[PDB]
Design a protein around this ligand. Structure first.
Ligand SMILES: [Fe+3]
Length: 54
C-alpha cells in the first residue's frame, strides 16, 4: 500500500499506521478511507492528497 501526502500541509498518511483517532484503522488503503475524512493537521479533504510514488 502506498503513502499519500496532503498537498496543502505536507502531512503523510501511512497505511501501516492509519489514523485511528478519526476511525481509520491501521491497514486501511487510502482509497478505502471514508470520503468525508479530512487531513488531521489542516482539515482539507481527500481530493487535495496525492500518492507518494517512489
Ligand atoms: Fe493537510
Amino acid at each position: 500500500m502506498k503513502k499519500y501526502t496532503c498537498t496543502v500541509c505536507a502531512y503523510i498518511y501511512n497505511p501501516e499506521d492509519g489514523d485511528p483517532d478519526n476511525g481509520v484503522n491501521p491497514g486501511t488503503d487510502f482509497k478505502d478511507i471514508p470520503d468525508d475524512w479530512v487531513c488531521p493537521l489542516c482539515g482539507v479533504g481527500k481530493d487535495q492528497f496525492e500518492e507518494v510514488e517512489e
